[PDB]
Each structure stands twice: as structure tokens, then as C-alpha cells.
Amino acid sequence: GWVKGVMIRCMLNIWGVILYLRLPWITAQAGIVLTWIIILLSVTVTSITGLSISAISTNGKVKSGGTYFLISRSLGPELGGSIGLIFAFANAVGVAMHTVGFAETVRDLLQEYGAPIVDPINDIRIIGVVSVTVLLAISLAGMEWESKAQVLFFLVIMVSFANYLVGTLIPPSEDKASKGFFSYRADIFVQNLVPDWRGPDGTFFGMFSIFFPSATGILAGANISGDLKDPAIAIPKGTLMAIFWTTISYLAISATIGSCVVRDASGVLNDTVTPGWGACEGLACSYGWNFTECTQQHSCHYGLINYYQTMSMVSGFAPLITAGIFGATLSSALACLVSAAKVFQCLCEDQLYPLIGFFGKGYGKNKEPVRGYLLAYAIAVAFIIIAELNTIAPIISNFFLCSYALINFSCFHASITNSPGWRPSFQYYNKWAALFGAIISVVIMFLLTWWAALIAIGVVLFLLLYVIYQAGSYNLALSYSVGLNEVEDHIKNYRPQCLVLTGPPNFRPALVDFVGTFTRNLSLMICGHVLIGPHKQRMPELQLIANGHTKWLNKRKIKAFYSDVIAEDLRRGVQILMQAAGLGRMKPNILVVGFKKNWQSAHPATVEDYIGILHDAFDFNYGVCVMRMREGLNVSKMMQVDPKALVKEEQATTIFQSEQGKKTIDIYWLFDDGGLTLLIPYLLGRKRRWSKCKIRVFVGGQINRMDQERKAIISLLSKFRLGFHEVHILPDINQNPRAEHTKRFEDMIAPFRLNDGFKDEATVNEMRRDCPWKISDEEITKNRVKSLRQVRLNEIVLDYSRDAALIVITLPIGRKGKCPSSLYMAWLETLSQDLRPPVILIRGNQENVLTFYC
Amino acid sequence: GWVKGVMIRCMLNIWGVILYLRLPWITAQAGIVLTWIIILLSVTVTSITGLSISAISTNGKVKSGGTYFLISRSLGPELGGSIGLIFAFANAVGVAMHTVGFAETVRDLLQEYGAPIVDPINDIRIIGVVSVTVLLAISLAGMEWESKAQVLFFLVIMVSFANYLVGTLIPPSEDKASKGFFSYRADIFVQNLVPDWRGPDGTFFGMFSIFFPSATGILAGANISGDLKDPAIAIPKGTLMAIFWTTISYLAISATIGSCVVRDASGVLNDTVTPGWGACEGLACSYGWNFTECTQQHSCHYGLINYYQTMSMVSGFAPLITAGIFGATLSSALACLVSAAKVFQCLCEDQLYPLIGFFGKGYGKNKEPVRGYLLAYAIAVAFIIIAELNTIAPIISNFFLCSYALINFSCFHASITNSPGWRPSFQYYNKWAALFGAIISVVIMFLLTWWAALIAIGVVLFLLLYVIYQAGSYNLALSYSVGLNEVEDHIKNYRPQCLVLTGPPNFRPALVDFVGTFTRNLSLMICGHVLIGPHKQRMPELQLIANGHTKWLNKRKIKAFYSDVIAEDLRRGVQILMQAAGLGRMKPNILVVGFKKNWQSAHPATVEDYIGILHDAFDFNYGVCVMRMREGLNVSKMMQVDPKALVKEEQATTIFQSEQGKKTIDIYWLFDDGGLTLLIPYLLGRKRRWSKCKIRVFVGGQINRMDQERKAIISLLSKFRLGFHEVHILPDINQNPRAEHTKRFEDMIAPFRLNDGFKDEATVNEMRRDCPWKISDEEITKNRVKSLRQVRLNEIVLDYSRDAALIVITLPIGRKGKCPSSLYMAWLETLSQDLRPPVILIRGNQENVLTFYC
């Protein structure tokens, strides 16, 4: 339920050692008014944190429970992981504080009854170590008696409170009056209403740092959210009621102990007032006691400000309050230890931090964090070695204030940024109240001591930034794609979607880098390897080889999407890839095909396949490009870096980027239909390294007009962001070429004079003028026109461009049925046959433009 | 250039009041060693910040930009705005500091002539406010000549340094020796090597806070940008050289003033030691000077630790050092004043903060920040009212340390997160050096004083958090989906990428719906429509058809991509789309096929093509699935105005489409592997529609042991939440053969014997064995028992699951070369016979299981 399950659990964890041992002393040094102010200032922070905790408990629905699990699932991995670690450390030090208080009580019992062990501080150390070892032994094995222990502890604390209140009303005896107790008196109340400020810790915030661990423990209700009936209505009321009732108890005890005991008293029973004309100085003189001797010399042993166990002295039966101290300290220490271990284990099971993951495994059948229990025990022992409560308490105040500020600010952050899963139903949660609580918690943390607060904030920032440096990554790409399913065919975004042939990626990598240069974070570039084996498709050995190849490619920091194809020949192999690659609107639009360095050496029939590539690409309304670099195409000389992944020379391509380019692109327009002609040069022409480029826009501009035909391209020039009027009119585009060049063009096809790959087509010629080698207006009979033109282009490139870093060569057009594949190949070969420049071939598909950069 | 452009004006801003007024006093209170440590510790912070600033300057080619512009464009707006605000405030307070130093110098000058105004402190206030008003008047109008005033200031400071050194070289005069300066002496150097803390400000960090303004002024090099020939080379050299040379000057002045002036001296010229025995003490006694009275009485007026103007006294010509102080102060204060105003104006140009202060508005033709100038003047006057360098300097140290820590951490943040616009070219920039600089800056800021450091940090946090609080996806894909291309392969999450073959999307819409409600933002679903085109694409209008189908899909709630493949048949027709659909990881993983229910009407070729897709899916590691309906998946759409969404009638046939599933789904998963067999109804179950259907597990096979295998299944069920433990036994497959069910099958496979139309099979078979059911290790003989099992599965569909949402039977498996096509197709027809509700068959590729949803 909510009473015993939640409120009593929070009660037993909030009530602890400072309630019995230091609250009367805080009331003595700070007075009743400032002690109440301290109590209320701590309760403000803890109640604002409790409202955030209640909002967390009402957010969504969590069935397993746990403080770290609730906070992290409601607030996030970064803030949740910082909270689950600072809170775990704070709970580990709380064990040390409560065990030190229990050890101090046992030491006082030994001093009054019997003999001490070694030394009043060393006895505290020894008893604390032994008691924390016993607590660890109980936690590891023997955690089934917890309901009975909870009932016994709550009843013993109730009995201690009742006995203290009963003995306070009793009129003082000789011993109690000697020790400073005079029942209730207005004079003592008025005297103790004001501070005294003795010792090094006499300070308002010095007292706040010692009292504050009396207000912590409000997170015990959230620890068992899974093991409750209805957490959304049980955790808030239980936590808030526990905070309220413990606040009432602290205020009442402070008020009644301030009004009963004087600050200074001496245990000597002879200090009763002598019947004569004495010089009695203190307030106790009116009550018949003479405490001047020690009060003037600051050597009193008893009193509110000098005796730490005055609460037990005041009461009717000291052993009952001793049992109450034992119960409170043991319950709080056990709760802190088990909470630290369980939060740390759950935090470690979520791999958010590198090295803590070792303390994440459980033992036995219920998976107890034995490693976490041992780490918490080690931290507790280390802080127990400090045998002073007034030293441990400020540390716990700092770390619990840091944890509460973190929780409050995490709730405020989740509220202000409208976090997805952050939907609190708690009626009394306000994000500005949480922000105020976090701010005041940090301010108080720095006010108690600045260096420990700085260390805590530094650790918090380290963890938060480490984590920063059910979201999912696959579903996001899917969501963006389907959102694009509603993309507008309107303003067709003719991004340079391209399809690339490389075969194995380690071979022909010049294309890879090339189409990798541009469309970097601009569009899609798809690599394409076609396996040419028609028999035994390596279904098993396809993903693995791709993996390896993609890793190599990825090691090159490329931006592509390799693709594997099985087929019998090149033609149908790429035909499969072009019309089915991508998905929906996410489809490739441009094809680039690697040239075969050795085509005329042997294997004649491959000309058909290679030219069918281009013809089917033309018919498919794709973009088309050829690939032939300075050096040989296929890498077959290795047996004497090699993996571009390791090292990628790619000089032929890297020249443009690695080296600062001083020579420019040269294009032309003999085929005006090609719109891409102003895009592929645009794309590549606009890259970081490609920055250095004095764009030479060579175009067949109108021989008389440079302002409406050439500027027709200049008005459009703006969108292509060209900014160049370099329209170099070279009307010598197709002038009669060199005699020698035509000669070579011919005997090039002399071996292939026949349509060897076209017997069928020869029969067609046979029935049509029987043209064996010369073809009317198709080969050289009349088609020579285009051949002499293209060769003139070659002369041009070789004369004007001469040494040309790169050339935008427009692939010429041949329509099937009026020109053979042979001549087409012949044209491809003669595009750059004389030498070996880098073939930056290009041609478009009469598609619209001005997509990139307007 | 770089010298005069950067380093000369960085020195002029770094040199200021503390160089002449408090450095000797710091060397007096702290030791020479401790003063050197302070200087080097400040220079470490400023040099790390200078490295960060040099990295910022060499980032990109930002032109015509101040300090704030550079920082906010290289770094983020969130960090840039806070940096600009803190830097502007720090400069505004530095104006007050340098004006107070100038006023102190003028007040001392007035006192030495015996003409004070009102009193020491109020005279400082009056002179400082008048000076700062004159400074504001110069800054507003009359700055045109500040370009030539720079040379005068630099030459004046150089002359002051030379005069100080020359005067230090001079042997003592009677007046100078009386005032404490004798000369370079080893004894004085040794005496001043050790610290001597002699006031409220006497502490290591107390002197660090006063000195540190001597090291600030390096960002003065940053705001020059736009007036430099080459910032990427000028800014780093100038800034670092200025830091080095000013550090050298500070160290030299400290070590030379600590070696010639004693800490205690009296301006009385009669202290000269009187001859006789005496009891004279002190180091000066050895030089004939008995300063005993003041030293013991602590009433000395002169000396290093008492006189604030010791550089002036030591130097040969006092007015020259006064001129040097004037030049240094009026250069640093003017630089700070015209830096704070410009940074604030640029910051207010960016609508980054709500209360702009409107100081952003420029005046005149140069758009000078008159409003910003007045705000800076007001802040300077407010901090001038303090009129004490030892109090103003700690504030400026705090705020400049905050600014430098902010810059260093912002550079580190940009480096570690790999910001898109952060690619610094500075060779000596390291993000860990920047992190160290920011951390030590914050530590020193809190060490000097904690409350002002907390105020500055809170202001920075407030600003930062306030600022913190169409082929787009195409492009977004580049960063996410090609970021999805790089993802590990060891994730092995069996993404249920699904492929479908409904032909036209409108037709066979039931499969579309089924594959759409499932994978609704979970898995990729791709719609493949085959146009079986045997010629040139009919028209681009086909693309219109594509947009019409995508609109149809969007007219409902589908997340489909539409693609098409041109072919001449179906087997190859799907085969094209099969191994090329998708791209990289996103690629479809399983395949569903529109069942050609009509199979006894058309030639069996269609049936052979049909078995083709399933066999190919078996060879390509794909998943096979198939639906079936009573009225017709390939419903004739018989026809037996604004027609509304046919969804209503459609969903009648497609419950999943809209109707929340009510009746139970049953997985007749005779086959175990191919997890999708269960996954399909599973992520179908996740669906709210199917949340109303107990997921029935109809396992079948062995009867002797049931749960023995199940315990493996319930382990993977703990992983794949089921919520049930009752798997109904299907012993029908065995010992339960029903004759009338065999007779139908036989009468259902007649024209299907050797109807594969496989002439080669017939031939090879004919030369092996004759009869169409003789050579039957494959022909419905060895696998006949399988046909019995199939018809029994249908019978237990009619009994065990008489009614169900979808009867999920495991899709059968047939071996190529060991299972004929007609036998398999008849098996499927039995498994999905008539008079059944929607029915689905599945069989995965047994890659791995449990990968999804644990």
C-alpha cells in the first residue's frame, strides 16, 4: 500500500542520526528561530524535489521500478546516468554517516557502562567498521526479514519519541538539573531563541550542512515503484506525507529541546547555589544552580551546546532512546546501502560508462549486486575512517543537494523542451518550481563549501558530456524516406543521382573518387559491381565479400551504396541495376561506364555489349558518362596503398582536390539537348578543394549574338552559380580535320571492317545494297560527317586545351537503326585516342534544370 | 601588415595599469619566485586561449568580422552569444579599471604638487569619471586619428621602459636610497625571493586576481579581422608574439624591481645610520640606512610593499614613466571601450536575446554603436565609483577568465562533436589543450573568489540554455542513411524489409494493406509494379501513373515506395527488381507475391513463372510469403460521380486495413526456422488492431514430446514477449489421413501432370523413365506424404482454428531438381483453399532468429 509501503519506508530513511545526536546541538548553537529556518530551508529543497519525483512516478507507466530506472526512462540517458551515479555515491557515504552515528552511540554507552576500547575516536572507527561489516553481511545474505525489521524500527522510533516527550514534561531531578534540564521554562526558551555560534562549525550554513542529511531519504518511495499497488497515486502522497511528518517531528523536537536545557551546564552535583550573598551569573541561578565556574572558563561538560546526548539525558528512560538511535541509524544505513547497490547495478547494466560495467552482474538467484555491495562497503569504510559526524555530514549534504538539483533540473529540462516521453500527470508539478529548486540547491551547495560543490558539479558535467559526446537510427531513415514519399514531383529536384560501374572496388577506383568528389552530402552516388559468372551464384559469398568491400570503401570515408549483381553478361547485368536501384523517388538518374583499356587486342564481340550499355541508357531516360583516365583502366600489375582504404593515391582524381587546381573545365555544345551539360560541370565545379577554378565555359554560342542565346545561358548562369562570361567561341568546332587522323580512324576499324558481331545485320545489308563494310550514312559512306567532326573536337582539345587537367567531353548521340554500335565504339575510342587524358565524359537526358542552388 | 596590424596593438591592450602600479607591489608581497609563478600561470591560460583564437581565425575565409563575428560563425550561436556578452561586459569593466589607474596616477601627481581636490578616494572618483567622459567623447567622434595615436602610445611605453631600466642602473641618490631603492644587490634579491603577505589582499590567489588583468587583451587581435592582409597567418603570429613579449616584460620588471628596492622604507632622509654602537636592524643597515622605527611600528610610507609608485621613483626621470602610465592606460581603456561597444552591437544585430537594448542601432555614416557606447560608459562609471584597483581587478580577472574558459571549451566542443563548420587549419591547436585551458580557467576563477565565479557561471548557463531552448530527406539521407550505410554489420537486426508484387498498387490492395499496417514505421515496404513492357517506355506518362499510384497510397495511410520494372515475362520480370531494389542496408529482405488464384484457366506458363519467384527467393536468401482471399486477391474488380475511398468495402476483405483484429491469429508454424513465420503475426500483434487477438501457437509434428522443444521457444519468448503458454497440438498431420481429401487433390492435379511445359525435362525424363508419375522420387510420391500433411493442415484449420484472423501456415519448401512446380503449386492451393478468412503463408531464409525485439 501507500502507508506502510511508501510513507513508512520514506520515514525510516529520512529519520536518522542527526535527529537524535546533532539536532539539540544545532538548536543550541543556532537558536530555535534559526534552527527552524534551517529545517524549513532544507524542507523547501526536499519538497520541491519530492514534487518532481512524484511527477516522474506519474509519467507513463513503469512496471519494474527502481530509482535509476524511473529517472532514466522518464528523463533520458545523460541526466539519468548522472543522477544514478551521484545518488549512488551519496547513498554510499550515507552508510558511513549513519554507521558513524551508531558507533558514536555505542562508544558513549561503553564509556558510561564499562571501559572504552582504545580511544574515543579510535573506538568510533573500530565500532563503525565492525557495524558496517555486519550491515554488509546482512545485506548480502539475510535480506528476507525486512518487513519485521521495518516494523521493529518504526515502533522503536515511536517509543523513543514518546519517551522523550514524556520525560521532558517530568519535573527535573537533581542529576538532570545539574546537567542543565529544568523541564519547561520561558526564560530558557527566550535565551535559546538566539544563536550562540561556538566552535569552528558555528555558522548558519555550517549548521545547515550538518542538519541537511536529516531531510534526505525522500527517494525511498521511488525505489520500490515496481513492488507497489498503484505507484502514480501512492508514491506522491506517501513521499509528501513522510516529508511533512518528519518536518513536524524535527520542528517539535527542536522547539522543546530549546526550551528545556540551558546551553552551559556542569555535571557536578555540588554546583547547587550556596545560601548566601554570592556572585551567581547564569540563568540557572533562578532555578537554584550555580554553573558560573565552567561557563566563564568555557569548560562545561554538559548542556545543550556541549553534550551531544542531551536528548537521552532529558528523557525518562535513556535506554529507550538508545534503542531508538540504534533503530533509526540501522534502518537508514541499511536503506542507503541497498539503494546505492541497486542503483549502481542498474546503472552499470545500461552500458553508458566505460569502466563501471564491471559492477553490473548479480549473484545467486535474485541477482544481488555483490560487487556493488562491496564497492559501497569500501566507500563507506573509507568515509567511516573519518570518525567525526560533523565532517561526514557536510559531504553528504553536498552530494544529496547535487542529486536533488540534478533531478529538479532534469525534470525542468524535460518539461521545457517538450520531451517525447515526458508526460507527467501530477497535478502539483510545475517546471518553474523545479527550476527554482535546482537553482537554490546549487546555491546552497556552493554556500556550504565551494570546493566540494565545485567537485560535484565537475563530476556531473563530466558524466553528462561523456554521455552527450527508444530513438533508433533505422526507423528515422525510414520515416524521412516515407515523408519523401509525399515529395513533390513538382520542381523535380534533378540532383546528380548517379550509377557507377567499378566492378571490384579495389579496381577502377578513379571513378569512385570522381563521383565521390561532388555530391558529398548532396545526392546519391551508387557503386555497381556486376558478377559475370552465370553459373553457381555465390549466394553465400556475396554479402561477406560486399561487407569486406564496403569496409574497404568505408575506410576511405566514401559516401556511396555498393551494389552486387549476378548475371551472364555486362548488358543485361547493368540493365537489371539501372531500372530497379533505389526505391520510389529515391532513384539513380545518371550512368557512368568504365572504358575497357583493351578492346581491340582481343574479344571483339564486347563492343556490342559496351555500346548496348549506352543505347539502353539513352532509351531509359538516364544520364550517361564514359570513364577512361590517364593511366590504364584495370589494375592488373600489382605483383611486384594498393587498398585505397589503406592509402588512396587516386592522383588522377586527387589532383583536382589535393593539389590546388589551376587549369579549368572545357565543355562544348554540339548536342544542345543535353541539359546535364551545365550540371555535372556545375556540381564538380563547386567543391571545397575545387574552389580554385576560373570556369572556362566553352559553348557553341550564337555566332552573332552573345546576349540572348549566350546570355540565355547567362540569365540561367545565375542559378548554376557560374559567374563566368568565358564563352570561348571556337567555331572551328567541326572544321575539316587532319588527313592523318581520318586515316587512323579507318584502319582502326579495318580489322572490324565487317559487322562481325552482326552477321544477322549483314544479311540485312545484303538484302539492302549488300554493304559488307562501308555503310551508307551509317559508317563512312556518308556518316563520316560526324566522324570528322568528333575528330576535329579531338584536334581542338589537343591544340587549345593541350595539356588538359580534365575535359568535359560530351558523349555524341547515335540512334539505333541508323548507326551501328561499332561506329559508336569507334567514336568512344577516338574521343581521346591519341593520348590518355582523363575521360570526364558527359551527356544529359533532356531533363529540366536549375535544381541545385536554385 | 601583421606587426603593426596585430602584435603592436595586442601589446597596447595587454599593457595597462597593473604593469606600472601593482606589479612592484605584487613582487613585494609575494616573492620574485611566486610572482613569476603567478605570471606564468596567467600566461598559460592566455596562451591556450591564444591558440584557440588562432584556430578560430584560421577557420574558413570569414571577411570583415569582429571578435564576436569570428567566434559566433566558427563556433555555435549558443556558445557565441554567451561569449560575446561576457566579453563585452569584461571589456566594459576593464574600461573602469584602466580609468581608475589613470585617475590614481593623476591624483598622485596632484598630491605631489600639493593641490588635491577633496580627498584621496573621492579625487580618484572625480578624475576617473571626468577621464571616462573624455574617453567616451573621443570614442564617439574624434577617433579617426587613433590610427596615429597608436604609434605615440607605443613609443611612449617603450621610452618609459627604457627610462625605468636606465634609472635602475643608476647608483642611489640620497632621496632614492631613503625611499628604499638602492641598486641591484644580491641581498635584496634574496630577501625578496620569499613571500611576505602584509595585507587583506595578501594571498597567492589574492595577487593572481589583481595581476591577471595584465595578461588579458589577446582578443584585441581577433577584432582586427577584416583590416588584415591575411588573417590566417597574421592573427596567430601577432597574438602569440604579443603574449610572449609582454610575458617577458612582466618577468623582467618583476625580477628587476625585486632586486633593487626593499619592502620597508621611510621617506625621511634622516634615517641615514648614525655613527655609534646602535641597535640598528634590517637589510638596509648595511647600506647606511636605519629604517628601524617604521619597520617595527608598521607605519612605513615607502618601499616596495608600501609605495604604489615605485617604478616612477626608481627611474631616472619620473615624468617619463608618468607619461608611460598615461599612454598605457589611455590605450588599454580606449581599446576595451571600443571593443565592448562593437561586440555588443554585433551581438544585438543577431536577434539572439529578447532585450536587445537597441544598442544595436548604429549612428552616423559608420553605424557606430552610440547606444552601446553609452551602456559601456554607464557600466564603466558604475565600476569606477568603487575607485580601487585592488577591488576592481578581481572582478575583471573573474570575467576575463570566464570568457577565456568559454572560448576554450567552445573550441573543444566544436572539435569533439565534429561541427560542420569547424575545420581549423592552425597546426598548434589541440582540443585537449583547449579543454585543459577551460578547466584551469574555471578552477582559477573559483579559487580567486567563489561567489563572483558562480555568478559568472550562472549567467553563462542562463544565456546558453536560453539560446538552446523538396528532396530534403534525400539530403538528410546523406547524413542519416549513408550514416546508416556505415553502421556495424554485427548488429544483425533482422530488419523486416518487405517486398511486394501486387502489380498495380490499386489492384491486390489487400496485400498492400497487410504489408502496410505491419511495418507502419517499423520496416521498409516496397511496392513493385511490373509493366511487362517489351518495348521503349510507353511514355513519361507512365511516371504520371507512378504519381497517381503514390497519391492513391497517400489517399490512404500507406508508407509505400512505388517502383517499376520493364520485362517480357514475370519470373525474370520480378528477378530484375529482386536483386537491385533497395540500396545498401535498406535493401528488401523478404518477398510477398500476389497469388494468381486463377491457375486452371490460363496456360501453365504463368504457373511456371509463378513457381519461379518462390524458387528465386529461395536462392537469394529472401523470405517467401503469400496471401489468399475468398473473393479474390486478384479480384476481377468486377463492376457487378465522386466515388469515395473503397477502403470501407476493401477493409471488409481486408480487416487489417482498418478493422481492429478481434479473432485470434494462429501460427501453424510446422516449420521452426524462418523466424518471420512468427515475427509476422508478431509485429502484426504489436499492432493495436491485433492487440485484441490471443496469439495462438499451433505447433505440430512430434507428439511424444511437446514442451521439451517449447522450453527453447519460451526462452526466446521471454525475449519475444508472447503472453501465452498454450500451444495446441496438431496431431492431424499423422495417423489422420482422410481419403476424400486425397481424391479431391488428385482430381485437382490432373492437367498439371508434366504440365510444366518443360520439354527438356520430358526428354531427359523420357530417356530416364517414361510415365509422368513413374520417375517420382520427386513427383508427388516421396513427397506425397507431404501432400497428405498439407490437406490435413487445412482440415485442422477447419477444426482446430475453424475461425481465425489469419491462418498463418508455414509456407512449404520445395527443392529445385527434387520437387516439381505443379506439385508445389497444388500444395499451396490446398493450404489456401476456398471458404477461409484472410490467410497468410510465411517461410523465412533462416539467417538468424531473435535478432529483433530481443
Residue numbers in the entry:
A (entry chain A), B (entry chain B): 137 to 605, 617 to 787, 807 to 1020
Q: What's written in the study?
A:
NCC, encoded by the SLC12A3 gene, is expressed in the distal convoluted tubule in the kidney, responsible for sodium reabsorption and playing a pivotal role in extracellular fluid volume and blood pressure control. The first branch is Na+-dependent cotransporters, composed of two Na+-K+-Cl− cotransporters, NKCC1 and NKCC2, and one Na+-Cl− cotransporter, NCC, responsible for ion import.
Full-length human NCC, with C-terminal His and Flag tags, was transiently expressed in HEK293F cells. Like other wild-type (WT) CCCs, our NCC structure is also trapped in an inward-open conformation occluded with substrate ions. The dimerization contacts of NCC mainly derive from the extensive interactions of the two CTD subunits, as described in other CCCs.
